[PDB]
Design a protein around this ligand. Structure first.
Ligand SMILES: Nc1ncnc2c1ncn2[C@@H]1O[C@H](COP(=O)(O)OP(=O)(O)OP(=O)(O)O)[C@@H](O)[C@H]1O
Ligand SMILES: Nc1ncnc2c1ncn2[C@@H]1O[C@H](COP(=O)(O)OP(=O)(O)OP(=O)(O)O)[C@@H](O)[C@H]1O
Lengths: 539, 26, 539, 26
């Protein structure tokens, strides 16, 4: 359990130094299962696009901007107001919203028969209750969520039978086709900004500095290295009598400065979109190092007095919109938005450490007694690994299991002469380097010489499992002692000659790590002569 | 550890096997 | 063992609704150990003072202020520079810094003797090596950290014995007494601001808005509900040709506004500290609802041209300092800073939920087989709890343990007439309410009527363990079957007459929760007649 | 759960007890 405070204090007062040294034994090492690097840290991991969104919220807030949420869904005529006649072309880029009608369907008599053939007992009453539920669904008074519930309730059947009725008796529901409206999703924040400002200016003291960082949707040819069907705009508007394009320049500098950028460039936007005053629509470029090229991070301009007029705004307004995903690409060094935004549809490679922590000890003794017995036994072997043969090393110990004592005589030996007790590889340690697994000896005596610079490099740069051959071997041995005791076996022999695989030293690897090791076509080279012979007797 | 739990359950079951056959041996 | 995708898809494709209902069995319920509320959420918990510090950094950053770190340690003469002659009084509140000298000690034969008597073999060489280590320590070239190491290294002894030599041969080290200096800890940020500003003004374009939120130290008579020896100042300075107190007023308003405050008060500071221009030192008050009274959150003013002059600053400077702990007291509703700041030295009460999650099931079967057997058995009893006596309920089941089959006949009965199989309390459920534990029946027939409004209230407002008597009872029974099999026992009877304690239904409570249950003088009332008789036979 | 782990270890040990004394019976 825990340790004796009194005994520790007394031992320490007799002689502090001995006590400090000796008292280390009161601190147990962890179960082999849970030693580093098999012990992994757990922490929450943010998404780059969303951390960039928060950092942008704060870059705007720290410039005095007031945070807003604008309408997402806007009528097409809003886009005609802002873009003018150009909207008959620009509206190609916007998603229209469409939706299913309600079905007008009735009950009886063929349907009544279907429902009866389902095993349902229907009154006239039940038939009317359901006739009403269907009416209400036609008239829009019941949600789709709720229709299985209401049917079930109507006929007094199970929920699932409600669904059964729905799909069996009324399959014409499947013939509903979505019909489009005049409503669209905003393709940039502006489509909302006008609506928000039109209502807001008259109520507020100018100048206004507003911002919103929120989703926008474009209907594009395809998705790109730098384009998605849905993106995030880090948009703002500055409203005031004296506003000009320079305000956009200053907002772009202030946003980018806070992210570390010292160099960006402005460049006229050939499009000259009509919601912007002529010759004010400006592109902002920042440098993407991994791509080598300059990338468009933002766009700004001053709204056209014509659009502003159509929204009852009589004062100039500067707009700036920065694409969150672009900035994020630069920040985190991604070269493909699709792979940055949705990394789940791509691959998750395991590092040397990841793999080193997926290498586990197979059989280990379950009982504390024998686990410690194992550790001690390991240290014993490591102490006599060089005994000159013929050798033997006995360990007799008594274990008490309630009433009965059993005495375990584990003996590990070497009959044949001119040998040593254990062999050149018993202390080999399993490393992982560059996707490879190597069981490496502490010194390269007798190692083939092409191999040595590789193993030296893995031993230097790679990640260790901190498991030696001897460790897994002995845990296997003592686990076999436990196994023996519950199996009514009094004697057995156990031997590890030349080690050829992970299995041979009682280790295994998580299948996910194997799949990669193979897939990347790398090696698991665990090998060595480890001639360990043991006999155990259980009296 | 999920593997350990099952190993210990295994030890328990074979202890019961051995007890059963040690009973009907006698 | 996961579930069969192919079998599922096929079952679902035959008849979706049946399949949807039936496949619930493929979602295994959790081990009783890990069912809610014994399963607790785990998350990191911020400290109110530090969370308030961060929110304050952001309140300052969002006003355009530039964040700084100022010197913490300042010479007393700095305080005379700022406070003028008043510093001969004000310096009372400041901590002086002191430190102990290096000892001048030599070796020589009396000590050499001690070191030998310690068991250490000392050469002339070792003696000279240590003579140097002691020299270097006098001359300040060895850190205290490092001295036990160096001593050991000198004598070629263990680390711990390096320490032993240190404390045994040179105990005069203990006679070192601390000597004071002229250095003090800052008692407010101002003591740093001047220094910082003196260096910074010449290098920068005015106006400057700087802020720092960092520790300050005072020597108070004693610590208060609202005073600690060390506190955090959320200080700032505004530097510019046109600053006046009004800048302090807007900084105080802007800080407090962002925290939700719509209400604060200004009040002249009677002190008229001399580092502030006359009649500008102002106190800021905010309302502490729980205390009922108005509390001082901040202080501001304009530095005195005399103090500014002594720092080569020729332009007015407004300073404001808000005490973080005060603001935190208001925000989180604490009435005692010492208890808000250092809550570990106070008490941690366990909520009803806390205690309900510290009620554990004692014995539960280890083998999956018997665990499920147990659940099945529970449902069987709950199904036959009302069988009219004489009753009996057999459950014969055969279990396979490698080679051997064993057949377990669990029989649950009631021989005596005019009763039922189980009894009125068998489905009672354990609740926690207002620090109390109650085992409560689903209905109040036969309950003394004094009790009923209480138990009704606990059942409505309290927190349930979601454990019924029958649950713990049966887990205990089957656990005993397991014990039996391992113990070579083929028959036993098992009975639960009247329930009197938690133990009677195989439950126990965490020691920490009991300590409170007792300390707070509350009850653990679980009792009921639950007459369950069972016989178990193992063939 | 640590309590469970110790219970299962208990089951294992008493299984070994029962085996040992079933041996010295025969
Ligand atoms: N599909 C998209 N994915 C991510 N960000 C976009 C997308 N479309 C536009 N943006 C962002 O919005 C801003 C304005 O888009 P704009 O159309 O002016 O330039 P573009 O990159 O040529 O786009 P488009 O392909 O629609 O012409 C850009 O700075 C970019 O940050
Ligand atoms: N000991 C302290 N603990 C916590 N906050 C303090 C402490 N001393 C001062 N403060 C904060 O610093 C500001 C200025 O302190 P000031 O000494 O002017 O007022 P006070 O509360 O009377 O302090 P004191 O009584 O220690 O002189 C206060 O608004 C308070 O927020």
């Amino acid at each position: 359990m825990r340790f004796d405070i009194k005994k520790v204090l007394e031992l320490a007062e007799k002689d502090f130094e001995t006590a400090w040294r000796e008292t280390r034994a009161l601190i147990k090492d962890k179960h082999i299962d849970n030693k580093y690097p098999r012990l992994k840290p757990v922490y929450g991991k943010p998404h780059p696009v969303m951390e960039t969104i928060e950092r942008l919220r704060q870059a705007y807030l720290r410039m005095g901007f007031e945070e807003m949420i604008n309408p997402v869904i806007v009528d097409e005529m809003e886009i005609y107001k802002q873009f003018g006649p150009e909207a008959m072309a620009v509206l190609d880029r916007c998603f229209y919203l469409a939706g299913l009608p309600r079905p007008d369907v009735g009950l009886g008599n063929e349907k009544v028969e279907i429902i009866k053939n389902l095993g349902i007992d229907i009154d006239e009453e039940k038939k009317e209750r359901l006739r009403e539920v269907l009416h209400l669904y036609k008239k829009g008074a019941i949600d789709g969520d709720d229709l299985v519930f209401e049917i079930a309730k109507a006929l007094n059947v199970s929920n699932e039978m409600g669904l059964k009725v729905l799909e069996t008796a009324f399959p014409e529901f499947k013939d509903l086709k979505p019909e489009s409206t005049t409503l669209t999703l905003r393709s940039h924040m502006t489509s909302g900004w006008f609506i928000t400002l039109s209502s807001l200016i008259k109520k507020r003291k100018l100048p206004l500095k507003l911002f919103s960082i929120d989703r926008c949707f474009r209907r594009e040819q395809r998705e790109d290295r730098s384009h998605l069907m849905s993106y995030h705009s880090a948009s703002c508007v500055v409203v005031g009598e004296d506003v000009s394009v320079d305000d956009g320049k200053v907002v772009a500098e202030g946003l980018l400065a806070q992210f570390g950028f010292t160099k960006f460039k402005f460049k006229p936007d050939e499009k000259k979109s009509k919601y912007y005053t002529p010759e004010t629509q400006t592109e902002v470029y920042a440098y993407h190092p991994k791509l080598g090229e300059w990338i468009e991070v933002a766009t700004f301009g001053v709204y056209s007095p014509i659009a502003l007029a159509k929204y009852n705004i009589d004062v100039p307004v500067m707009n700036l919109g920065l694409g969150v995903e672009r900035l994020a690409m630069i920040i985190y060094g991604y070269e493909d938005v699709r792979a940055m935004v949705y990394p789940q549809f791509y691959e998750y490679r395991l590092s040397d450490r990841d793999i080193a922590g997926m290498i586990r000890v197979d059989k280990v003794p379950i009982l504390d007694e024998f686990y410690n017995f194992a550790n001690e036994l390991i240290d014993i072997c490591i102490a006599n690994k060089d005994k000159e043969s013929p050798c033997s090393v006995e360990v007799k110990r008594e274990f008490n299991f309630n009433g009965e004592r059993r005495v375990i005589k584990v003996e590990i030996f070497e009959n044949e002469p001119n040998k040593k007790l254990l062999g050149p590889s018993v202390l080999n340690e399993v490393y992982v380097y560059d996707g490879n697994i190597y069981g490496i000896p502490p010194t390269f005596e007798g190692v083939k010489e092409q191999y040595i610079p590789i193993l030296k490099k893995a031993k230097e740069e790679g990640v260790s499992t901190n498991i030696r051959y001897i460790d897994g071997i002995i845990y296997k041995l003592v686990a076999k002692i436990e196994e023996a005791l519950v199996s009514n076996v009094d004697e057995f022999k156990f031997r590890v000659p030349i080690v050829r695989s992970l299995s041979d030293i009682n280790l295994k690897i998580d299948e996910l790590a194997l799949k990669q090791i193979m897939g990347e076509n790398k090696v698991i080279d665990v090998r060595g002569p480890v001639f360990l012979n043991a006999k155990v007797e259980i009296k | 550890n999920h593997m350990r739990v099952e190993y210990s359950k295994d030890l328990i079951r074979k202890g019961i096997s051995t007890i059963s056959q040690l009973k009907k041996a006698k």
